[PDB]
Amino acid sequence: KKYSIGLDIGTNSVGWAVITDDYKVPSKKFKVLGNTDRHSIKKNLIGALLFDSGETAEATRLKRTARRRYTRRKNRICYLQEIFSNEMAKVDDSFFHRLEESFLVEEDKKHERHPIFGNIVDEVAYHEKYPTIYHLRKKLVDSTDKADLRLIYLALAHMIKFRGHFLIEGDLNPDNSDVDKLFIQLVQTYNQLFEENPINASGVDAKAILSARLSKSRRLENLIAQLPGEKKNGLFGNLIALSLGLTPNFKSNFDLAEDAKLQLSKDTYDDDLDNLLAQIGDQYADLFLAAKNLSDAILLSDILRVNTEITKAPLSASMIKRYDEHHQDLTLLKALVRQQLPEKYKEIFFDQSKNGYAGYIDGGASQEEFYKFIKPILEKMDGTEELLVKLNREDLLRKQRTFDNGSIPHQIHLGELHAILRRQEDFYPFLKDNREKIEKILTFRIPYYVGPLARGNSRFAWMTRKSEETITPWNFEEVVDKGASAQSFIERMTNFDKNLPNEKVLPKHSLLYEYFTVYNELTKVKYVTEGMRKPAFLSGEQKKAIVDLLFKTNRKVTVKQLKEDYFKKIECFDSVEISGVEDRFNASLGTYHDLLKIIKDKDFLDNEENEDILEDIVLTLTLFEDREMIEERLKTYAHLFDDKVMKQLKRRRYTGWGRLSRKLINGIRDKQSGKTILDFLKSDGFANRNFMQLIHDDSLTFKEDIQKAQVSGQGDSLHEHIANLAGSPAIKKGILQTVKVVDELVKVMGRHKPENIVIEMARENQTTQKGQKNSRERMKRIEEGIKELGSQILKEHPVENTQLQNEKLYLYYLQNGRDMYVDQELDINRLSDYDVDHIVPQSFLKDDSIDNKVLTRSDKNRGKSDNVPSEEVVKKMKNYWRQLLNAKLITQRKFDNLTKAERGGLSELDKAGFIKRQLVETRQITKHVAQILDSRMNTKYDENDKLIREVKVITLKSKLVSDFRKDFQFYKVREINNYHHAHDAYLNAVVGTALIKKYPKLESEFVYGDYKVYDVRKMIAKSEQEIGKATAKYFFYSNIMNFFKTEITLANGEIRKRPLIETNGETGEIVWDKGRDFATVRKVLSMPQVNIVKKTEVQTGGFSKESILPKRNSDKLIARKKDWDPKKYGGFDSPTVAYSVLVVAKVEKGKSKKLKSVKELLGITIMERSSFEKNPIDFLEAKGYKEVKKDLIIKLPKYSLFELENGRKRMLASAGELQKGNELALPSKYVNFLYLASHYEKLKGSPEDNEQKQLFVEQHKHYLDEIIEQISEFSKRVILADANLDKVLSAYNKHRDKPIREQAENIIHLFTLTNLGAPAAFKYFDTTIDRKRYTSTKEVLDATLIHQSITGLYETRIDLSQLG
Amino acid sequence: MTTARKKFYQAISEFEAMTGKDVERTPQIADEVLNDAEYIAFTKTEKYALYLCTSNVEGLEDRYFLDEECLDSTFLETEDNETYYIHFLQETEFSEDDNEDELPLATEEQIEAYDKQEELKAVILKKELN
RNA sequence: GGCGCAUAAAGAUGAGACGCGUUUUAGAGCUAUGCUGUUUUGAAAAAAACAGCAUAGCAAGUUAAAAUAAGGCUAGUCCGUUAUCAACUUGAAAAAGUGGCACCGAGUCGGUGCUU
């Protein structure tokens, strides 16, 4: 028999549904394998699969970069030890052998205790002579005397392990060192970016004012006192506050809605910077770059301050002075505590655990926690000056190694290393001719493009070699190849396009991509002058004239500038309004003006023959970052250049890419024209279409030419098939699992291929309550309603703007306090009898938006047709509707919808756009999973080359299945069970097949496949109701789901009867039998036994918790290295178990060591997993077990089903964890009542529907005292948690007289007592009771185990009672 | 941005959305405490009542076993001068193998503390992350 | 599902440098009192601490070295947290193969018929 398959796709879950023609899902007897007694099972053939969310792969990249940075650092130490390897055996032999042994206990250490200087006495003289290493190197830089060799070594091994940042480039100079030139640079870029109402700081000079010794949160007021500017929250001032660590906002500043926090100290600066930058536009972007640059400069002036004896030690001689202001200003504070407070001295300095000075060094604290703790104590003290003024400026009791010395340019370290080798070169022979090598291994920043220096054993590296020996930074140039590695670089991390593969996408601001974006916006802009009487868009030559006459002038151009520099100048057009471009252009020709400034030539950038030259200069700028390789690739174009731009053009960077390559834009041409995408989008003619509409087109050749090459050549592997998709890795894991369960699911149903397979996915409900989203733009419209109307409605009743989530008052206040039907007013408190109507009825669309819904008093005010309302209602309000469109209260679309008295009503193109507006499904993941699942099961051939399309792929939205769910009382709420995955998929089959069986002809737009161009403009009748299932048109009512309606209903009261048992309109076959549909559908959604399975996994991941903890006598610690026994050195605890093993063995129990028989679980961590599977029996003998039966070693991963008495299912997450497995057979009337009662004001349908649900809940109040005892016997069978259950029964008894809506919401929160997974603690009315975790794993050992298959249909049951 | 860093930042973002918004200078906590944290709780007082659960571990039923052991109790400050205390927590992986010790038992000071904590409801948004 | 100006965005993957943080050891702790061995004109004693412990008061208090997932072989200035996975029968691995169909019903699936 024929059958059909339906698929819900998600992150956590995937639902598989198998229906016949008659919609009764099958039910088959399957075979059981193993040694149990139930030799046959009888299972339904419908189910879901849920599983852990597919995690991304960013944490692994982070850990890999950390591992390689540590290995590079240790080998820099290895090189510098090897350069002293001769002459350090001259001084003291085992010295490097003791710096390697600086970590173990003195007892098993095989040398003396003191690392440096050997003995006891010289070490103490070293500490009380040199207090710290910064004092050490600040001494021996200015030291004519000869130093000790190991002393210079330990000054230098500290020197190369802490190197700073390479974010600055070149060497330091006062154009980049001090804040003077940088502040001049930022005021220059601000003055250049606005070029209007500017600010100039030539008088006031922040080279010392901004560099002063004060508080930053007072220093910005100092600077705004010096330079007037705008305000303390002005944009210049907010950017200066961004330059000093403060976090301003810009919503009062940009004239934008949302706030904008920015700081440099967070890890997520760039991900929020581009997030705000996409909201505001890119025209500010480089300015913020200078802001960060300026910020780093002042942090430079935070660390190095002494400029008097600043020669040869700018870093180390500075903060030793900070050590001095730490030392005496410690003693002062002690000399201020005991004199006035003898108590709270033992809890400050002998404390160790309470955020005091004892915890600030010897324990866990920070600068800021300690400052907050000594704020109330030291602020209370009577005589304490020069401490509060030092506390607000963050410079008291402050260590050397901050979290804010991550702003050290490495040239400071390199300069003092240069000095530290100059002042020793006169003495030592070996050191005189290796200073080049030492400075080289300091400054060696291994570049981006040269990759991991591998020798082919990589998985990630690509660099090639011009020789074969050991790579050193001594000789990095003449070993690795530059140009070949760069050529392998650019083609590897290029990004192919999903719109056209095998091509390198263009950069984010190429000239061609900019022309693409400006000609994708300007092909949908319309102008109105006096005389056309209907709005019209531009022509091609007008587009050429405006891009040659306004875009080349200014970066951003407003519509005012457009109409006053183009229509007035050469067009002589005066009374013009423009509807298309709103106020400004979000697309900008930024790099056009940039490179115009760089080259200072107007002919060259405007000449159309240098296009690949300019775009690959931009490409090599945006791809490479270091200063060396960036220049010789410009030496290819050194002929045109003038040797002054070399220090200018190599400065600008870019980041990020565009969307599409060059071979898709200026590439393929039309078969009947010979023009490209760009060629039409500047020269098209009158039909001013769009680019995405050109993708949305069917008749043109370009979309077909796209899907020519969207398939690959030879068919790849399925992992290689999913390898070039998009989205999260979670949905990729879901797609691979759904292909696996389809390809296994064909196997179980007689190995016949299916007929109709259905797919969809939907997720991501994270709107965050929408409380400020209305008052930002939508409700904010009435704030510019004051700009036009003047009626301050809130002036008579100030009503809050965060509880507008109720739709009736929302649509009232979005209606000017008026009606769009008759000239009247409304009562705010009597809105219950006032009725919500629709601009288009429920027999043409389905939407619940402000574009659709309006609010009024009487339905007779609308009109007496299913079409648009009457001509007087639009023409008597044609004045005011221009105001509330002009005040942006409603959108353009619904205003154009009511004014269809000009256009007659429902036009043929209009009803075509509605009939296919629902079914254009334009999410790329749907089309790609359609392609993947098409190419697997549909491959047989015939006498010609074309494909026998055996199995029809089909793709429906969630809107149709949500509507079939809602209107026919088939409700669901997610928190009851996890059946609402699987049942959801079932409806996706039904609305699937009953649309294709009823519409055979119009499947040619949402099957993936080559079909005809047969449109819908001649498929809907332009007249009255045609013949029932005998006419030429497909339908008349533009809502597709009127087919499922038993009896339609519109606002005219025309209760029109579509026939009872519907039959398809051209072939005569019943598709949808009313007497045997909803009985069958309500029976199948009320079925108790659905196969949901949690699939097994082996827990890959970390060895243990990533926090090594101090020593203790507990033996369950995991060592750091091999010989570091954790009863002395401590370390890792709580290992992650990958999979347990069931082992039968014997133990050496008793004093006589007698081998008693045992059968137990044993956890296996990932630490010895490979050590397990290389030889299991030897490792198990090493664990302390004998008589290992190798056949009986039962592998048992995470999430494995155990079944035992009375159907109790428990599933095993670790060695000492269990999770509840069973679920509820909760029938259809209970779930329908719980959703309908728990949303007593949350349905928004009909007032008759409102009285029906009200009388329904008031007559079916009898349900909440049978749900409770169902849960009682259920949880008494499958949970056996008696105490909390009796607690919640009494707590239910205590709220018996509670109202209905709150009690229904609390009972659906009560349902999470009995889901799957780990048990949780739930918010009840008041009595939040404790979760009850299972750890007693003894009962698992004598139960039955189910190794189930992937869909849960196939299975095998193994037994553990007789397992011996 | 680790697997728990940016979701910690949206955690304190929706904390600032629940109450007075003027937050400033989130605490730079290390990765070692963030990548092994099960629940981020927010509250008003520095003394955090920790939760509890029962079991069925070979008899000893209807006793109280604490689960969420504190490993980091830092604070964040808002504008102006209102102190909220962040708490990171770890689930206790206690098995059925001990000498009836180091499995965390009741010691009913925390029981009375949880009674006062539930009665006063000083707990703010407590959500799971990893 | 929010398709939200009716569009539909773009998505993941990979290279480099930090700066932290954590943990042991090294930075001879001092004074006074009370417990543990020995010395001594000696009979255990008479008592000197050289060392160890506890209890009170004082002194400083910042910095280093090592490691930063156990380690592995392919010995590299490489690699080890993601995608990959039910059993069973083959196969080193890859990959392949391993399960009867209707009907009446429904408390996690049951019952009946026909049949290799």
DSSP string, A77-95: HHHHHHHTTTTHHHH-TTH
User: What is A142-163 written as a DSSP string?
Assistant: S--SPPPHHHHHHHHHTTTT--
Among A1012, A1165, A1200, A1176, CA closest to A1095 = A1200
Q: How far is Cα of residue A452 from the mean position of the Cα atoms in its chain?
A: 28
**Mode of pairing for the β-strands spanning A526-528 and A536-537:** antiparallel
Three-class SS state of A1152: coil
**CB A96 under 7 Å to nucleic chain C:** no
Among A1314, A1351, A1282, A1317, CA closest to A1212 = A1317
Are B71 and B40 within 8 A, CB to CB?
no
Are A1199 and A1213 within 8 A, CB to CB?
yes
Among A678, A637, A642, CA closest to A523 = A678
Handedness of CA A1133, A1137, A1138, A1142 (dihedral sign): positive
Give alpha helix (H) positions in A227-261: 235-242
**CB A258 under 7 Å to nucleic chain C:** no
Matching residue, tokens 């944490």? A59
Q: What Å value separates CA A3 and C1' C3? A: 33
A1330·B62 Cβ contact <8 A: no
Q: Any chain A CB within 8 A of the CB of B80? A: no
In the 8-state DSSP scheme, what is residue A566? I
Closest partner residue to A1106 (CB to CB) among B24, B35, B102 is B35
Among A507, A515, A506, CA closest to A605 = A515
Chain B partners within 8 Å of A1216 (Cβ): 93-97
- At residue A1294, φ and ψ (nearest 5 deg) are -80, -15
Closest partner residue to B9 (CB to CB) among A259, A268, A1330 is A268
Q: B76 vs chain A: nearest CA distance in angstroms?
A: 9
Catalytic: A271?
no
Matching residue, tokens 């007032």? A1247
Closest partner residue to A268 (CB to CB) among B1, B24, B53 is B1
B55·A368 Cβ contact <8 A: no
Nucleotides on strand C with an atom closer than 7 A to protein CB? 1-28, 57-72, 74-87, 98-112
**Buried/exposed A421-459: b ≥16 CB within 10 Å, e otherwise:** bebbeeeeeebeebbeebeebbebeebebbbeeeeeeee
Distances (CA, A) of A152 to A84, A336, A420, A431, A544: 11, 41, 9, 11, 70
Are A634 and A649 within 8 A, CB to CB?
yes
- Classify residue A855 as exposed, middle or buried by CB count within 10 Å of its CB (0-12, 13-18, 19+): buried
**Mode of pairing for the β-strands spanning A1091-1094 and A47-50:** parallel
Chain B partners within 8 Å of A354 (Cβ): none
Three-state DSSP string of A165-200: ECCCCCCCCCCCCCHHHHHHHHHHHHHHHHCCCCCC
d(CA A869, CA A876): 12
Are A721 and A932 within 8 A, CB to CB?
yes
Among B36, B93, B45, CA closest to B65 = B93
B55·A263 Cβ contact <8 A: no
Are A550 and A596 within 8 A, CB to CB?
no
Catalytic: A8?
yes
d(CA A441, CA A1206): 72
Among A1295, A1296, A1297, A1306, CA closest to A1238 = A1306
Residue nearest to nucleotide C85 (CA to C1'): A1097
d(CA A1001, CA A771): 46
User: What is A393-426 written as a DSSP string?
Assistant: TT-SS--SS-SS----BHHHHHHHHHHHHHTTTT
d(CA A644, CA A109): 63
> Which residues 19-48 in chain A have a CB closer than 7 A to strand C?
26-33, 38, 40-44
Chain B residue with minimum CA distance to A1280: B56
- Token couple for A547: 């891009």
d(CA A769, CA A1195): 47
**CB A708 under 7 Å to nucleic chain C:** no
Count Cβ–Cβ pairs < 8 Å, chain A vs chain B.
93
Among A325, A266, A264, CA closest to A299 = A264
Are A761 and A926 within 8 A, CB to CB?
yes
Are A312 and A416 within 8 A, CB to CB?
yes
Q: Any chain A CB within 8 A of the CB of B74? A: yes
Distances (CA, A) of A567 to A528, A577, A1351: 11, 11, 67
- At residue B85, φ and ψ (nearest 5 deg) are -105, 120
Three-class SS state of B79: coil
- Neighbouring residues of A425: CB distance < 8 A, sequence distance ≥ 6: A431, A432, A435
Report the amino acid identity of residue A930.
Answer: A
Are A1337 and A1218 within 8 A, CB to CB?
yes
Are A1008 and A931 within 8 A, CB to CB?
yes
Closest partner residue to B95 (CB to CB) among A62, A1332, A1335 is A1335
Chain A residue with minimum CA distance to B9: A268
Number of helices (H), then strands (E), belonging to chain A: the values are 51, 26
In the 8-state DSSP scheme, what is residue A1085? T
**Mode of pairing for the β-strands spanning A1070-1072 and A40-44:** unpaired
Report the amino acid identity of residue A24.
Answer: K
A263·B57 Cβ contact <8 A: no
d(CA A160, CA A439): 10
| Method used to obtain the model | cryo-EM
Chain B partners within 8 Å of A1280 (Cβ): 56
**Mode of pairing for the β-strands spanning B39-43 and B82-90:** antiparallel
Residues of A with CB under 8 A from a CB of B: 55-56, 58-59, 62, 247, 259, 263, 265-268, 271, 366, 368-369, 372, 403, 768, 1105-1108, 1114, 1134, 1214-1217, 1280, 1283-1284, 1321, 1328, 1330-1338
> Where on the phi/psi map is residue A656: left (φ > 0), alpha (ψ -120 to 50), or beta?
left
Q: Any chain A CB within 8 A of the CB of B101? A: no
d(CA A472, CA A776): 59
Closest nucleotide to the alpha carbon of A748, via C1': C99
d(CA B81, CA B23): 11
Distances (CA, A) of A146 to A88, A129, A1227, B16, B28: 16, 16, 91, 60, 43
B36·A1338 Cβ contact <8 A: no
Among B116, B25, B118, B109, CA closest to B74 = B25
- Neighbouring residues of A453: CB distance < 8 A, sequence distance ≥ 6: A446, A461, A463, A471, A480
Chain B residue with minimum CA distance to A1334: B55
Give the CB-side neighbour count of residue A322, counting CA atoms within 13 A: 22
Give which of A1285, A1335, A1341 to mutate to test B binding, by max B Cβ within 10 Å.
Answer: A1335
Matching residue, tokens 């508080």? A215
Closest nucleotide to the alpha carbon of A891, via C1': C5
d(CA A1079, CA A1083): 6
Closest partner residue to A1216 (CB to CB) among B17, B52, B96 is B96
Are A838 and A866 within 8 A, CB to CB?
no
Element (DSSP H or E) covering residue A1072: strand A1070-1072
Angle at A1108 between CA A1102 and CA A1113, to 5 degrees: 115
- Neighbouring residues of A673: CB distance < 8 A, sequence distance ≥ 6: A680
Are A979 and A1225 within 8 A, CB to CB?
no
Three-state DSSP string of A1299-1363: CHHHHHHHHHHHHHHCCCECCCCCCCCCCCCCCECECCHHHHHHCEEEEECCCCCCEEEEECCCC
d(CA A395, CA A816): 58
Catalytic residue, candidates A8, A819, A963, A1077: A8
- Token couple for A238: 């907010």
d(CA A259, CA A261): 7
Closest partner residue to B56 (CB to CB) among A403, A1331, A1336 is A1336
Give which of B46, B57, B115 to mutate to test A binding, by max A Cβ within 10 Å.
Answer: B57
User: What is A263-287 written as a DSSP string?
Assistant: -SSSTTHHHHHHHHHHHH-STTHHH
Three-class SS state of A22: coil
Closest nucleotide to the alpha carbon of A350, via C1': C61
d(CA A1067, CA A998): 10
Are A815 and A825 within 8 A, CB to CB?
no
In the 8-state DSSP scheme, what is residue A902? T
Strand partners, A165: A409
Give alpha helix (H) positions in A627-753: 629-632, 646-649, 677-680, 691-696, 701-709, 718-722, 729-748
Q: Most distant CA pair in chain B: distance in Å?
A: 52
Catalytic residue, candidates A418, A593, A838, A1309: A838
- Classify residue A603 as exposed, middle or buried by CB count within 10 Å of its CB (0-12, 13-18, 19+): exposed
d(CA A621, CA A633): 10
Report the amino acid identity of residue A1169.
Answer: R
Are A861 and A822 within 8 A, CB to CB?
yes
- Neighbouring residues of A177: CB distance < 8 A, sequence distance ≥ 6: A297, A300
**CB A54 under 7 Å to nucleic chain C:** yes
Distances (CA, A) of A1012 to A998, A1009, A1016, A1260: 19, 10, 12, 53
> Which residues 191-230 in chain A have a CB closer than 7 A to strand C?
none
In the 8-state DSSP scheme, what is residue A1136? P
**CB A1125 under 7 Å to nucleic chain C:** no
Report the amino acid identity of residue A916.
Answer: K
Where exactly are the structural domains of chain B? Answer: 1-130
d(CA A488, CA A467): 18
* Composition of chain B by helix, strand, coil, percent to 5: 25, 20, 55
Chain A partners within 8 Å of B21 (Cβ): 259
Among A828, A827, A823, A855, CA closest to A839 = A855
- Token couple for B39: 């629940």
Among A855, A850, A851, CA closest to A836 = A855
d(CA A569, CA A557): 16
Q: Any chain A CB within 8 A of the CB of B79? A: no
**CB A766 under 7 Å to nucleic chain C:** no
Where exactly are the structural domains of chain A? Answer: 59-165+410-490, 179-303, 320-391, 496-709, 771-916, 1219-1334
Q: Any chain A CB within 8 A of the CB of B27? A: yes
The four Cα atoms A283, A288, A289, A293 give a dihedral, to 10 degrees, of 160
What stretches of A277-383 adopt beta strand conformation (E)?
A: none
**CB B1 under 7 Å to nucleic chain C:** no
- At residue B14, φ and ψ (nearest 5 deg) are -80, -20
